[PDB]
């Protein structure tokens, strides 16, 4: 039987590079948005400044049921230093213009994320959500923001 919890294409490449963008990226061009795929081997995504107004954005191109998000940090291949997001908020949109921060109850959902730079932490949405665009918005981090990502659900 089919279950709506399959990887949507970060690791597989089904989500093409052009579908992945960010608010900003670190100025040396060694931590680009396209380095944010789960199990990516060369660093990860890092914004130009570490702040809670930065985000990594995925355009799924079609309305898609989203059921879970997995994240990693990353180890710098230059320094061996580890960076990871400890918590984040999710922003979603059907059209790329009207954005809503994901809530559980009256308040924004704060997802607890990584506690090292290497392991995958999976968070399920409290209900499946029909969306086209996804933004991961780091709120807290260790040493600095670095992300690798997979999205889970199913194409409706």
């Amino acid at each position: 039987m089919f279950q709506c919890n399959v990887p949507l294409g970060m690791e597989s490449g089904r989500i093409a590079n052009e579908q992945i963008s960010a608010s900003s990226t670190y100025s040396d061009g060694r931590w680009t948005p396209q380095q944010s795929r789960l199990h990516g081997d060369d660093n990860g995504w890092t914004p130009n400044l570490d702040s809670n107004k930065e985000y990594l954005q995925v355009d799924l191109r079609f309305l898609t049921m989203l059921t879970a998000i997995a994240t990693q940090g990353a180890i710098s291949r230059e320094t061996q230093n580890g960076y990871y997001v400890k918590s984040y908020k999710l922003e979603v949109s059907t059209n790329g213009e009207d954005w809503m921060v994901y809530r559980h109850g009256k308040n924004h959902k704060v997802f607890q994320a990584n506690n090292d730079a290497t392991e995958v932490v999976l968070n399920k949405l409290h209900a499946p959500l029909l969306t086209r665009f996804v933004r991961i918005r780091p709120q807290t981090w260790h040493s600095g923001i670095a992300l690798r990502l997979e999205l889970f659900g199913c194409r409706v």
Binding site: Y26, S27, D28, R30, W31, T46, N48, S76, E78, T79, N81, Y83, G144
Partner: peptide, 4 residues
């Protein structure tokens, strides 16, 4: 900017 530094190298991380």
């Amino acid at each position: 900017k530094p190298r991380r």
